Every structure is written in structure tokens, then in C-alpha cells.
Design a binder for this molecule. Structure first.
Ligand SMILES: [Mg+2]
Ligand SMILES: [Mg+2]
Ligand SMILES: [Mg+2]
Ligand SMILES: [Mg+2]
Ligand SMILES: [Mg+2]
Ligand SMILES: [Mg+2]
Ligand SMILES: [Mg+2]
Ligand SMILES: [Mg+2]
Ligand SMILES: [Mg+2]
Ligand SMILES: [Mg+2]
Ligand SMILES: [Mg+2]
Ligand SMILES: [Mg+2]
Ligand SMILES: [Zn+2]
Lengths: 60, 99, 118, 25, 91, 155, 82, 206, 128
RNA sequence: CCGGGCACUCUAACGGGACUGCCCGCGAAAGCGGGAGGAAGGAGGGGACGACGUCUGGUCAGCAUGGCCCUUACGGCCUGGGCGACACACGUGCUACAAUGCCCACUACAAAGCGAUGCCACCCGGCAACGGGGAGCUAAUCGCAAAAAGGUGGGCCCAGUUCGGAUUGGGGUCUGCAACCCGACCCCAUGAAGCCGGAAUCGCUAGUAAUCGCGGAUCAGCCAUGCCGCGGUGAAUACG
RNA sequence: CAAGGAGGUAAAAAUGACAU
């Protein structure tokens, strides 16, 4: 259960509460940020890549 | 009467592109209120540094969204003429409304 | 003054003295003496006998309290005797009623620890 | 009494409002 | 007689024949060992050379360890003709 | 390994008095970082001193501290798995700290009801040489007294 | 705790009501506590699923807000060594 | 070990972005997914070019895409194909201004992604890795570099035992901010597994 | 009526101090320098630089304050009062330095750091 | 609030600002001690940054991937159950045992952030949760929010007590197709254990520990007392 | 000023782990 499971995450019918978030780059169901549509893992990868517009290291 | 707003992620491109419009409006017959620095809306998020499960010690990032305002007096088509479609941004979002 | 089934609380504010009855608590307390029209900050020490009579007559009537409602509460649990539900079995086994965590805690219904060891 | 649901202090701690802590004025 | 499991994969292989908890090439191996630990009436029977039997030391005292393959062990407590806490683990 | 000898922290002088000592006492009163309640209690008790005695609290408090000062204390030291207890002298910094600490503690040890009256009374008792803190002070000096044997280990 | 809804399964009720005219047989199953005790057809048995099998629960008044499956424990426990 | 991505470590000062557009919520998510699918689709049928970067810029339905390549040999003169429907096939799920440009990366021996990719090809050619590392470094160092460092890790030359081959000449200060350090990485797919190639290229700054 | 500089800051607190040369030792903002600061013992310490100088009520105080809590505001007022009397009396420098009434005092609340429970307080552990 | 003004405060963009450069003393130098110099100092206070390597460390359940195995099934869909079980054991915590305290009323003073498929002012019903209305806000404009500890006034008077809130009965609300197993609140009634902790064991050196509330992520809702942040008041001690 | 040759010496504290 992983391939047929990233299917349902985009399928989204039948009751509105059965629909859930899901990382697009991966298939992660946990720690999925609504802002990017990505898991915390993928988000970190791309942020170091530079492929995340404006996204920058936080030092203060 | 004409109010223009310029939002942006990069401050250096903003502080420069929203200064072009101060020069391109002043040298066309108008009084221009200079680069008004509206406060920034910092959008932070904190992610666990490892793909595994090391809760302590992570690493966070921020997405600073800058806002800059500029007002010009009379809406004459002399100043309008230049600021009409002579746009030079890198994706910088611009809002133009008069009230 | 033998208000309901009790009499105990002497010199200690009627709004507080009332509390010392199974059925009164705190809300029904001031509610009873504002509806009876008596000063809450009084001595409780057998003050005006009339106020005490009115108080007694109102309180002891109106709503069920003391040994009578203890019987009703116990009977409401006896409801889930028969061939009752799941909530009854939790009253049977002696375990928490509201489905909480019983892996640890739940000592207020289970009682002190027994320790098995192995 | 930070855990008593019948105080302005417990209602703060819980977050929610009510009779023992009205939504101001 | 085997009486209790600690490893779920081991549990399933002996009970239902479910092999998806162990390595695929160690299916026959693990099986013959478990049957031996099941038939064993005393620890002395689990003494064939190919098992490399020995009791563990330290906090694992009271346990035993026959060898499946490589760095892999089946550990258990044998007592009165029965093994308990059948685990499959690193060496 | 204390490369730096840790410089002595200095305080702010109080209101009305100018003490370089009273604020240190108010601090010991302070719990959870509420200097307001702390200072109030002391000044409250100062008002209480005026009643039971016609003395200015600036001396009553001063003398009390002076009476709850440990001349020498016992110190556990070397050889034998730290078996000895050499009676050592007490530095003016430490006499200072112990005096105020024992005062507040003994003050809250009293059976009274209000914090102010405990402070006031314990100060009056200590000014005389009667306080429970004075007990503590005299006790610590007994220990230091009984150890004069291997005191010559000193250091 | 609903108030303006207070619902029962439509499919449970469909099967329950069309088998309620002038009498029936107690042979009636379900798959959802979700419902509610339902007055009428009190003298009935509803085989409720507990996750493993269908337990014949019996209705004899007394029950109401307790839907079904409260009369169908899903666990067993039974004892802890003792 | 544990060291931060020398690209992300810069981002602000030194080494700018790679996808430069601004949007608020309700848009960022959609436009980032599209943006990444462009990078994903390009990488496939453009690897033979060996692309150092895939810069992307936007301005309301404008989507500019700059493809940096050592040798843009796969562009071939206007209507000679390799661009026409190729830069037009992007708008089969976009439909916006697919403005695709091509850049000429002068020296590939100073482009970290290209260096690592050349090395990762050689791993799959069944080359002697340690010698391949040494050469690639000197090759980078031969083309005027101020410092270089290549790293292959795991399963070297097949053989059951994960290793890590290491070579670096000149100066590579990762901790310094004014660094101008190019970082590249590549997956070498082998019949015995997968190994990763890091490549660090350094030039002066101030 | 009049003006005399005013910029006192302490731990996220901003106070603009004026003072108007008049015998009426007055207040500002909400109510009195009392009233607004009543029950607060250390509140009256903000007027200590005036005691350090020869001001037994020679000025009419006017300090608008904002940000932080009372204590920081009070501290900031002290910095502002001093910043005024040092401005229109450049010779009153030789008392603001030995007494040290002139410092912004960079002592501010330190950041919550991850892992730790709060600033520096470590989350406490057992090996077993 | 308007006229008008933008010098103050603030907002955010580049800069200036100490480099023990200056004085005394020590020294061969590096440097150390001390002093006016100023907001600041002898890395000013905190971040980001983690060498060669070590632990056959972690991680095939994020992802990629060699090999083994499964394929009318070790894959796929659904309803229901379960991850929430409880005779027990350990960790991290939250709330307390009270009077430098609790309750009620009044009245002040923050920062950092979030919101027009939402934040929801002001009215109206309601003891309340909340429901009806309904203005403003693409938001330094409108809203979330009154910060809380504090202060003023009053009441309890040291007793398991107006401490403490567990547990349980009853009545309700809101999200949700639906909250029995297992949701959060609200109101009435119950009011348990606990009167400060054995052997042991932890954190913190200055805005720090302690104490107080606030915001955000995930999120229909929420088991968050958690985690990541924000500011309020603000100790003690360091001989060694 | 700078040391060589001489003498009193810690305690109470054991063990070892699972393919080379
Ligand atoms: Mg999710
Ligand atoms: Mg933790
Ligand atoms: Mg449960
Ligand atoms: Mg704090
Ligand atoms: Mg460094
Ligand atoms: Mg291992
Ligand atoms: Mg995998
Ligand atoms: Mg779980
Ligand atoms: Mg008891
Ligand atoms: Mg008591
Ligand atoms: Mg330290
Ligand atoms: Mg032995
Ligand atoms: Zn992912």
C-alpha cells in the first residue's frame, strides 16, 4: 500500500472529511505543509537546492 | 491620487525597482512620495533536520514578503505615459489603484 | 440548623455552609439564597429563625438532594445492570467510564497499585 | 486552580470562555 | 513445545506458515530450528553442531541462542521442556 | 576550573533608604521574580517595627543581620574520602549571604499568619539575639567549635 | 451529541421498517453502531458487528441514546494472568 | 560527518536562486509543482546536453526558462528540430508563455554539476573510480580553478563493502561565506547498486 | 509649551521625555507619575537622575511611553529624563557617566532555542 | 478625529561605530592588569556555521536503489474493528498540596505572528458553550486579543477546608456522512488522592534560573498539558 | 640563590557479553 495510496490522496471524493494532504514530490502523508504541498523532508531538499523562490536559511 | 504597491521576496530588487518608478514619475511632472517601507510579513517554518527521527536539533527557514508603497499626485497622462507599460520587474508583483 | 439531612456548618457564611450538602455545590447555593432573599454573608449561627425556615422549605424541596438523589444516581448506574451496554461493563469491571487511557493512570477507579512482577 | 473549569484562571489556561469567564463586558 | 513468541515474524512462520516475516532464503532453515525447539524436551537436545548453542551473559542471563545463519540468532528461554520468548535478532 | 575569580555582583539601592543591603534582603523575600510583592512585604514589616517598638527599622534590620553573622563555619575537606571537617573562617561576603538567607527562612518558619509580621518579628527577635536564625547561627558555630582538633589542617 | 439531526442509518432503517408491517422475524443484521436504538421493533434482535462477528443484541426498552455497538464490545480482555 | 548544503548555505549573499518568482498563497503551491515538473521533464530529454542549471522566471503567464548547457549541440539551427515542438511540448499542461532560452556554459570543467555527471558516467562505464576522481580534479584544476574536491561514496567497483573515495587539490573552504563554491551531485546507476558523486568547485570572492 | 529631546529605551520600551521649565513637578500620558505607577515600588526610581542633579521639581514632566511592561518603561523613562537634562545642559555630562544613568542597557530577552525547553533550560534526562 | 506638519516614535534600505587604536604599569615579543574615551568594549550579547575521522550508529516505513521473495495473490476496493486494550514497570510532563495563597469585581502595561473556499467588529437570543444577524479587512487600514503575573477594592482565616481538582451522574453545544468503542467545550451536582515526597536523580552563571501569559505550524474537528517561537516581572551564588 | 643523593605512597571496590 503506497502506489494505490497516493491515488486516493488526489482522487478525493465520497465525504469531504475523508480527503487528506499528501506530499507531491514524495508520497508522505505526515508533516505535509499546506503552503508548499510538500513534506518536511522534500521541502528541506529543495530549499538547499535553491529551487524554492525566496526561501532562505533562518538566522537570528 | 494614484497609489502603487510593490510586493517582493528579494529586497534588493524591490528597493531598486520601486526606486525607478520614483525617478520615472518625478521627471515627468509630478510630486512623488518616496519609497514607503511597509513592514515585512515573515513566514517561518521549522523542519526536523533529519529524514529519520532526531527530534532535538533541527533547522528552520523563513519566507520574508516585503511591502513597499509609492504615491503620485496628479494622474496626468504625462506621468501615466511612462508608468503605463514601461515595466521592468523580475516577477515583482505590482498593484495600481486610485482612490 | 438541620436544613436537609445535615446541620453541621455553624459560624461560616450561609453561601458556604450550604455547600456542605450533597446536592448544593456552589451555583445552587447563591441561587437558593437570592431566590429566598437572604443575605449570603450572614453568620449561619442560628440567625433569624424565619430566614432559616424559608431557606429550609425552599432548599429541601425544589430539587432532589442528599440521600435521596444519591439513591437516584446509584439507580442510574443500576440502569446499566440488566443486559446493559458498554458503559455498564466499565462500571462492572471497576474501570474508567469515559474511554480514557488505562495502560497507566486510572488509579482513581482502579485503586492503589497491586504490582504483579515478571 | 489552573485546571478547574470554574474559574477565570482555569478558563484562561484551557483557553475557552464561558459563565466563569465572559467574553469581556 | 514452543509456548510464547517475542518476534512477530517468527510467530507467524510457525503458527500460520506465514513466511513474509523472515528472509526468503532462511525459511527452511528457521523452520527446522523452530521444530527442533518445539520437539526438544530438554536444552540438551538443542545441541547439534549446526546450531552453535550457548546461554547468553549479563542482562540476557537465562536465555539461549542457536544460530540460524551469519550474524543471526534465535534466542529464547528454555524451561521444563518448553521454550519461551522466541526472538529473532542481530548477533 | 574557575580561571576567572567570578567578580562580585552589585545591586541597585532601594527606595527611601539607600542601603546596599536591604535590596539583597528583599531579593531573598522575592519568589518567582515578583519584586513588587517582595519589597512591599519588607516595607510593610518596617511599618510593623514602628508599632511594637519606637525604633527605626534601618537599625533594627541592620543589627539583626549583625547578630545572625557566622564568625566561623565547618568545612568538609581532604584525605580519607573527604572524611574531615575543618572549621573555617567565614568571608564577609558569605556572612552577608548567610545572614539574610537564614533570616528569611526562619521568618517563614514562624507560625504567624502574614508574611510581614513574620519578617518584622524575626528581625526584632534577631536584633535582640533571640531569633530562630540566631539559633541557626549559634548552631553553625557550635559545629565549628567542636572541630578545633584538626582545625590545624586549615588551608 | 446531536440535537437537530439525531440520525439513524437509512439502510438500517430501510431493512428495519419494510420488515415491520404487521410483524416479522428476528433475523436482521447490521454493520453500524452509527445508528440509534430505534423505538418500535423493540421486541427485536439486531446482530451487530463487533469487528469479528455478528452479536445478537436484544432490545427490551430501557435503551435509547445507546445506539447499538455499545451492546457489542469489540475487545475481550477477560483477565490479566489471574 | 554532517555538513550543510553549500548552496543553501549561501543562497542570499553569493549564489542566487534557481527559480525566481513571487506569489502569495493559493498560487505558490500550484506554480511550484508546475515549476518542478518542468525541471523534471527537461532533465529527461535534455541530459545528452548535460545541463548545469535550469533557471526559471515568471511574471503572470510569462514563465521564462533558461537552460545552461556546456555544449548546446542539441538545439540545431531554428527549424532543424530539437527546439520547435520541444520547447512547445512544455505547454501541454501549462499553456503559458513557454519562453525557453539556451545558454552556453563556457568551461564545463568549472561547472560542478557537469563535473560530477562526467564522473558518474565513468562509474557506469566500469572505470577505475580512484583514477577517475584524480583526473577529474586535475581536469578542473587544469582549467584555472582555485580549488576542487570530488567525492564518490559506496560500493566502489562493486565488491561487497561500501567505500568512500576522496580527492581534493588546492583550496576548498566550505565554512566561509564569501566563497563562490559550486556544488554538484550525480547518481550512478550500476548493476550492483547506486552510488553518489559530490563535486565541489571553488573560486575567489571578497 | 516647550521641548527637550527625549529618547529612552530599555528592553523593548520607548519613552519620549520632554520637561518644561516650571515649578510644577507634573506627570503625563494616562494619569499621575503616581496613579499610573501606583503599588509599584521601583517606579519612583526613574526620577533619580533629577535627584542626581539640582531638580527638586524645576521641570514639568511630559513622557509618552509605549511597549514592554511598566518596569521597562520606568527604566526607559530614566534614560529619557537623563537624555533631556544632558542635552540642554552639556555640562551635566560629568554626572551621567560616573553614576551611569546613560546606557540603553542591551539586556533583552534571549531567544527560545530548539532542543532546550526554554532559552537555556535543558529538557532533563535519565540514562536508564 | 479634521486642517496641516512629518521634527519625535516607529517602519526597512544602505551606512557610520573600536581596531585594547589612546594613558599608566608589566614584557623580549605575543599579551595581561588598570584608567578617563563613549550606547558599547581586550572574541559586547545571542544565532547560522560542526575538521580528518569514529560508532558494521540511525535510517530499505519519505524518497532512490542491488539482491531475495509475492503475483487470481505478501496486490486492489469496501464496511466494521484495532492502533485508545490494563494485574502491572519505567521515561518525559501537566495540575496541585495553599495565606509571598485562593475567589470576585474594577482597572492598566507587550512582543512576535495568523487571517477575505477565512479572521469575524457591533448588535440580538442564551446562566454559558454557542446560535441568528451583520459592518470592516486582498489587511503597519479591518479582525483574531481583553495580554497574564501586576494594581485597586472586597471576601475567606488556616481547617482536606472558598486549598485541590480527579472520578462519576444528569443536561446541553459545535465540527463532522457519522463522535459506542474514541472528540473538544459548556452548565448543574458530585467533589477523590494529595498537608510537599525513600534510595536515588535533573536543570540553570545575567534578562540568565524561577514565574506569567501570547502567537504559529499540523488542523473539518481534536485528545496540545507537546513542539517551534514571543515578550512581561525578574533572583541566588561561584572561596575554590 | 639554583638541587642532587635520601623515606613515608593510593583505597575498599570483583567481573565481561554472545559470527573471524
Ligand atoms: Mg497530512
Ligand atoms: Mg524532547
Ligand atoms: Mg481507552
Ligand atoms: Mg521569558
Ligand atoms: Mg566559524
Ligand atoms: Mg547495525
Ligand atoms: Mg524501498
Ligand atoms: Mg500509538
Ligand atoms: Mg487523605
Ligand atoms: Mg494545612
Ligand atoms: Mg555557562
Ligand atoms: Mg566469574
Ligand atoms: Zn515528500
Amino acid at each position: 500500500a503506497r502506489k494505490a495510496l497516493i491515488e486516493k490522496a488526489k482522487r478525493t471524493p465520497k465525504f469531504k472529511v475523508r480527503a487528506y494532504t499528501r506530499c507531491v514530490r514524495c508520497g508522505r502523508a505526515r508533516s505535509v505543509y499546506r503552503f508548499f504541498g510538500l513534506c518536511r523532508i522534500c521541502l528541506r531538499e529543495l530549499a538547499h537546492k535553491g529551487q524554492l523562490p525566496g526561501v532562505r536559511k533562518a538566522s537570528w | 491620487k494614484i497609489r502603487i504597491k510593490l510586493r517582493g521576496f528579494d529586497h534588493k530588487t524591490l528597493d531598486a525597482s520601486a526606486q525607478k518608478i520614483v525617478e520615472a514619475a518625478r521627471r515627468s511632472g509630478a510630486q512623488v512620495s518616496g519609497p514607503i517601507p511597509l513592514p515585512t510579513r515573515v513566514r517561518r517554518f521549522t523542519v526536523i533536520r533529519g529524514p529519520f527521527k532526531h527530534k532535538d536539533s533541527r533547522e528552520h527557514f523563513e519566507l520574508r514578503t516585503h511591502n513597499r508603497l509609492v504615491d503620485i499626485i496628479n494622474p496626468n497622462r504625462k506621468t501615466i505615459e511612462q508608468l503605463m507599460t514601461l515595466d521592468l520587474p523580475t516577477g515583482v508583483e505590482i498593484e495600481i489603484k486610485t482612490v | 440548623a438541620r436544613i436537609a439531612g445535615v446541620e453541621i456548618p455553624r459560624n461560616k457564611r450561609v453561601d458556604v455552609a450550604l455547600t456542605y450538602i450533597y446536592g448544593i455545590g456552589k451555583a445552587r447555593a447563591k441561587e437558593a439564597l437570592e431566590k429566598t432573599g437572604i443575605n449570603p454573608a450572614t453568620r449561619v449561627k442560628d440567625l433569624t429563625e424565619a430566614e432559616v425556615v424559608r431557606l429550609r422549605e425552599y432548599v429541601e424541596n425544589t430539587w432532589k438532594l442528599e440521600g435521596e438523589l444519591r439513591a437516584e444516581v446509584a439507580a442510574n448506574i443500576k440502569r446499566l445492570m440488566d443486559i446493559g451496554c458498554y458503559r455498564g461493563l466499565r462500571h462492572r469491571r471497576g474501570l474508567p467510564v469515559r474511554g480514557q487511557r488505562t495502560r497507566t493512570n486510572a488509579r482513581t477507579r482502579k485503586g492503589p497499585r497491586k504490582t504483579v512482577a515478571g | 486552580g489552573k485546571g478547574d473549569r470554574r474559574t477565570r484562571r482555569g478558563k484562561i489556561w484551557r483557553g475557552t470562555y464561558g459563565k466563569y469567564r465572559p467574553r469581556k463586558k | 513445545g514452543i509456548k510464547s513468541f517475542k518476534h512477530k515474524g517468527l510467530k507467524l512462520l510457525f503458527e500460520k506458515g506465514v513466511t513474509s516475516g523472515v528472509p526468503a532464503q532462511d525459511v527452511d532453515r528457521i523452520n527446522d530450528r523452530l521444530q527442533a525447539i518445539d520437539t526438544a524436551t530438554e536444552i540438551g537436545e538443542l545441541n547439534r553442531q549446526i546450531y552453535k548453542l550457548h546461554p547468553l551473559k549479563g542482562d540476557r542471563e537465562g536465555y539461549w541462542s542457536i544460530t540460524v545463519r551469519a550474524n543471526w540468532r534465535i534466542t529464547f528461554q528454555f524451561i521444563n521442556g518448553d521454550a519461551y520468548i522466541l526472538n529473532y535478532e542481530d548477533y | 576550573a574557575r580561571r576567572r575569580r567570578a567578580e562580585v555582583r552589585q545591586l541597585q539601592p532601594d527606595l527611601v533608604y539607600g542601603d546596599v543591603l536591604v535590596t539583597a534582603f528583599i531579593n531573598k523575600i522575592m519568589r518567582d521574580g515578583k519584586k513588587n510583592l517582595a519589597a512591599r512585604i519588607f516595607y510593610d514589616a518596617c511599618k510593623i517595627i514602628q508599632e511594637k517598638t519606637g525604633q527605626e527599622p534601618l537599625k533594627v534590620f541592620k543589627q539583626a543581620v549583625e547578630n545572625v553573622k557566622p564568625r566561623m563555619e565547618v568545612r568538609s575537606r581532604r584525605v580519607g574520602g573527604a572524611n574531615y571537617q575543618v572549621p573555617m573562617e567565614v568571608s564577609p561576603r558569605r556572612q552577608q549571604s548567610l545572614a539574610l538567607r537564614w533570616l528569611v527562612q526562619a521568618a517563614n518558619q514562624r507560625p504567624e499568619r502574614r508574611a510581614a509580621v513574620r519578617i518584622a518579628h524575626e528581625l526584632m527577635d534577631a536584633a535582640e539575639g533571640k531569633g530562630g536564625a540566631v539559633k541557626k547561627k549559634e548552631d553553625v558555630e557550635r559545629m565549628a567549635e567542636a572541630n578545633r582538633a584538626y582545625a590545624h589542617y586549615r588551608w | 451529541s446531536l440535537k437537530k439531526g439525531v440520525f439513524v442509518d437509512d439502510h438500517l432503517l430501510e431493512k428495519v421498517l419494510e420488515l415491520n408491517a404487521k410483524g416479522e422475524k428476528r433475523l436482521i443484521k447490521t454493520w453500524s453502531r452509527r445508528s440509534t436504538i430505534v423505538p418500535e421493533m423493540v421486541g427485536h434482535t439486531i446482530a451487530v458487528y463487533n469487528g469479528k462477528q455478528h452479536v445478537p443484541v436484544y432490545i427490551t426498552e430501557n435503551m435509547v441514546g445507546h445506539k447499538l455497538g455499545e451492546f457489542a464490545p469489540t475487545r475481550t480482555y477477560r483477565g490479566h494472568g489471574k | 560527518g554532517n555538513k550543510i548544503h553549500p548552496i543553501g548555505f549561501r543562497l542570499g549573499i553569493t549564489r542566487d536562486w534557481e527559480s525566481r518568482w513571487y506569489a502569495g498563497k493559493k498560487q505558490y503551491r500550484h506554480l511550484l509543482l508546475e515549476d518542478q515538473r518542468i525541471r523534471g521533464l527537461l532533465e529527461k530529454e535534455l541530459y545528452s546536453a548535460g545541463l548545469a542549471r535550469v533557471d526559471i522566471e515568471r511574471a503572470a503567464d510569462n514563465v521564462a526558462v533558461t537552460v545552461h548547457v556546456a555544449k548546446p549541440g542539441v538545439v540545431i539551427g531554428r527549424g532543424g528540430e530539437r527546439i520547435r515542438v520541444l520547447r512547445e511540448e512544455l505547454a501541454k499542461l501549462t499553456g503559458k508563455n513557454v519562453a525557453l532560452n539556451v545558454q552556453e556554459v563556457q568551461n564545463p570543467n568549472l561547472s560542478a554539476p557537469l563535473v560530477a555527471q562526467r564522473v558518474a558516467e565513468q562509474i557506469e562505464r566500469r572505470f577505475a573510480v580512484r583514477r577517475a576522481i584524480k583526473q577529474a580534479v586535475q581536469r578542473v584544476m587544469e582549467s584555472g580553478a582555485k580549488g576542487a574536491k570530488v567525492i564518490v561514496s559506496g560500493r566502489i567497483g562493486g565488491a561487497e563493502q561500501a567505500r568512500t573515495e576522496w580527492a581534493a587539490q588546492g583550496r576548498v573552504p566550505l565554512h566561509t561565506l564569501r566563497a563562490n563554491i559550486d556544488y554538484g551531485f550525480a547518481l550512478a546507476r550500476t548493476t550492483y547498486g547506486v552510488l553518489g558523486v559530490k563535486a565541489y568547485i571553488f573560486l575567489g570572492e571578497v | 509649551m516647550e521641548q527637550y529631546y527625549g529618547t529612552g529605551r530599555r528592553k523593548e520600551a520607548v519613552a519620549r521625555v520632554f520637561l518644561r521649565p516650571g515649578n510644577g513637578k507634573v506627570t503625563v500620558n494616562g494619569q499621575d507619575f503616581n496613579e499610573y505607577f501606583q503599588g509599584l515600588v521601583r517606579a519612583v526610581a526613574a526620577l533619580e537622575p533629577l535627584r542626581a542633579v539640582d531638580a527638586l521639581g524645576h521641570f514639568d514632566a511630559y513622557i509618552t511611553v509605549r511597549g514592554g511592561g511598566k518596569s521597562g518603561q520606568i527604566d526607559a523613562i530614566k534614560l529619557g529624563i537623563a537624555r533631556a537634562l544632558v542635552q540642554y545642559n552639556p555640562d551635566y555630562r560629568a554626572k551621567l557617566k560616573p553614576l551611569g544613568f546613560l546606557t540603553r542597557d542591551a539586556r533583552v530577552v534571549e531567544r527560545k532555542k530548539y532542543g532546550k525547553h526554554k532559552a537555556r533550560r535543558a529538557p532533563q534526562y535519565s540514562k536508564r
